[PDB]
């Protein structure tokens, strides 16, 4: 499952909820082609990988979060662990997403 | 000065208003840093280039137009003349933007 971050504080709840697990955050918009195209693959990955937390942020609904994270392209995948930023991936490159997961999990 | 396209009808309105002039449309978001930084430069160009029309589209406010234009990064600059698309530019690259303006105007 990919959880939908509601707001800043809901973001920070999920982050602290995640324990020591890698968190992957998909910054997206409903109107963005590449976002729609990769979302099912992220969903599938999330159903498999129980040792990783998958989250998503709708940039139009959570404009503040998008700004806080210096988002300029969609989708942007942010990789976090224990509140720390590990990596970031701009674009819908499935192989790079898997690499980055593999590296950071 | 750079006019903010309100909706799809208004977009058509501005395209018609522009006449034969090259039109530069800045697809932006209020939360996007690079968008904020280049916007004064655009106002400046708008103010100085009488043979070019500058417009802007807030992707959060005009999600339909964003989708129609396959926007994925901001800022994204669309170049139109007489209703026709001539060129596009992804990102806040002023020099390229300027090169495409001089090229198409």
> Inter-chain contact B59–A33, Cβ cutoff 8 Å?
no
Chain A interface includes B32 (CB < 8 A)? yes
Q: Which residues of A are catalytic?
A: 32, 35
The Cα of A24 is separated from the nearest Cα of chain B by a number of Å equal to 20
DSSP letters for B16-71? HHTTTSEEEEEEE-TT-HHHHHHHHHHHHHHHH-TTEEEEEEETTT-HHHHHHTT-
Residues in CB range of B67: below 8 A, 6 or more apart: A31, A32, A33
The DSSP letter of residue A25 is: E
Question: Which residues are bridge partners to B80 per DSSP?
Answer: B23, B85
Residues of the binding site of B for Zn(2+) = 60, 63
**Distance, CA of B35 to CA of A77 (rounded, Å):** 20
Q: How far apart are CA A40 and CA A54, in angstroms?
A: 12
Experimental structure resolution, Å: 2.0
Domain encompassing residue B56: 1-105
Residue with tokens 């963005």: A32
CATH of the domain at B100: 3.40.30.10
Q: B63 at the A interface (CB within 8 A)?
A: yes
Is B33 close to A70, i.e. CB distance below 8 A? yes
Determined by X-ray
Number of domains comprising chain B: 1
Judge contact between B1 and B47, C-beta under 8 A. yes
| Cross-strand bridge partners of residue B54 | B24
The interface residues of chain B toward chain A in range 64-103, judged by CB-CB distance below 8 A, are 64, 66-67, 70-74, 91
Q: Which two tokens stand for residue A29?
A: 């918009």
Q: A90 pairs with which residues across the strands?
A: A76
Q: Which candidate in B10, B13, B21, B32 is catalytic?
A: B32
Mutate to test the interface with A, among B8, B28, B30, B31 (most CBs of A within 10 A): B31
**Tokens 């599938």 sit on residue:** A44
Q: Is B73 a catalytic residue?
A: no
């Amino acid at each position: 499952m990919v959880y939908q971050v509601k707001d800043q504080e809901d973001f920070t709840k999920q982050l602290n909820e995640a324990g020591n697990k890698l968190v992957v955050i998909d910054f997206y918009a409903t109107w963005c082609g590449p976002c729609k195209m990769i979302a099912p693959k992220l969903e599938e990955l999330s159903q498999s990988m129980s040792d990783v937390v998958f989250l998503k942020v709708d940039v139009d609904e959570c404009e503040d979060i998008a700004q806080d994270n210096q988002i300029a392209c969609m989708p942007t995948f942010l990789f976090m662990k224990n509140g720390q930023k590990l990596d970031s991936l701009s674009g819908a490159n499935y192989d790079k997403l898997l690499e980055l997961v593999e590296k950071n999990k």
